[PDB]
Amino acid sequence: MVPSYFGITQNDPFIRFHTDFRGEVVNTMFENASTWTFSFGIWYYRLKRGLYTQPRWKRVYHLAQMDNFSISQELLLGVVNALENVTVYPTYDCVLSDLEAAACLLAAYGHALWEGRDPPDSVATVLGELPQLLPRLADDVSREIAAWEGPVAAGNNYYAYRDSPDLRYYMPLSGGRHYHPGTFDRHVLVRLFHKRGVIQHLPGYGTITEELVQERLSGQVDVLSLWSRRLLVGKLGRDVPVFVHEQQYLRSGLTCLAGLLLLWKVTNADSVFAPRTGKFTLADLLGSDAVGRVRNFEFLVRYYIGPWYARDPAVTLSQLFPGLALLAVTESVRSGWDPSRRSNPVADYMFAQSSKQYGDLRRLEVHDALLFHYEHGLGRLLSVTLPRHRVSTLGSSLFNVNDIYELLYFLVLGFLPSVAVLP
């Protein structure tokens, strides 16, 4: 009964909810706002139009008024549910989120800077320090890209994973829980972390040294392992995973760092106090009755990410930012890339989540195709000359996002409504 609150933008009040932030915000919008007059952009409309002519999906998603940009609550919840699950690792034995894995890599990175930084005490503290750590990481990445050796992976992507065209599942299956040798060879973060001594021995990356054989023989033994244990023993005790051997945590953690780097880059582009371009107002979401250096990213860290992690430590980056997942997947799809060769993968996963015909394995395969697009699109967006410009272009052309204030809400909601139909 004690209400929960999240803060999205500094110019806005906090948003009240009981247990499910996104679900309750969506429900309030359909109950209090004139949704029939809204647009959610052409990407959402094209999805509605495509489904409208398919009787099964028209019924499941309660589609009505074929030539209206407005979408049903059922369709909106369907899309959002698919996006939220993108970086969820749905195995019975998943003990860490992509966010906690990213926090361990970042604490190890901070220690490896050798600048006398105050050691963080927990994942919550590392999250609190993202506004200080991410600019340093972004500077190091920019230097690593400028001095890049050998070829760049397909799509000018510096954050690429080298998977076989036949790889259909995200879970690592080589020698237990490792990805095939060479999977991380062209990934800028892995190259940087290996250069800074964050990662010392990564199976399938580089060559086995005499020191690994000596460690295996004598037992006399690593920055990543030390920081993973320090941050996660409170949560897991003795059962702390070794990221270099349970590579799903290494890969999800790296993808989450790429996601955080992109969020830090685009969220701080302009002030929420500057004159508005778009038509969205908080009243479109909650109803009329209910309502220097740019630091929009720090505001989200303190009033959204931090409080969510405190109440639900299983939270993943796609559950926090389903709009980021929609942008990244769309960037990959539009580029012509396909994980089956190395098309609506969001809609494909929505269908797999609702249909009783799909077994667990088929649903996982469709989930993993969406996640492969997500990783590729995220890497593409972060690798372009001006990431803000490409994100701005996709936002205004497809997702009804026209300024920084609308971008911030879109990233957190997975959609952006505004009055499109007026007398």
Residue numbers in the entry: 1 to 221, 224 to 293, 315 to 365, 385 to 465
Sentences from the paper on this structure:
We also present the structure of its β-herpesviral ortholog, revealing a striking structural similarity to its α- and γ-herpesviral counterparts despite apparent differences in capsid association. HCMV pUL77 is considered the ortholog of pUL25, but despite biochemical evidence indicating its association with capsids, the analogous positions around the penton vertices are occupied by a dense layer of the β-herpesvirus–specific phosphoprotein pp150. Similar to HSV-1 pUL25CTD, pUL77CTD and pORF19MCTD crystallized as a monomer. The striking structural similarity between pUL77 and its α- and γ-herpesvirus orthologs suggests a conserved function, in line with the essential role described for the CVSC in genome encapsidation and capsid maturation. The crystal structure of the HSV-1 pUL25 CTD displays a remarkable charge distribution with a number of positively charged residues on one face of the molecule (blue in S4A Fig) and a cluster of negatively charged residues on the opposite face. A similar but more pronounced polarization in the electrostatic potential was observed in pUL77CTD, whereas the corresponding surfaces of the γ-herpesviral orthologs did not reveal any accumulation of charged residues. The striking structural conservation between pORF19, pUL25, and their β-herpesviral ortholog pUL77 most likely indicates an evolutionary conserved function that depends on this conserved structure. pUL77 associates with HCMV capsids residing in the nucleus and is also found in extracellular virions, but unlike in α- and γ-herpesviruses, symmetrical cryo-EM reconstructions of β-herpesviruses do not reveal any density that could correspond to the pUL77 globular domain.
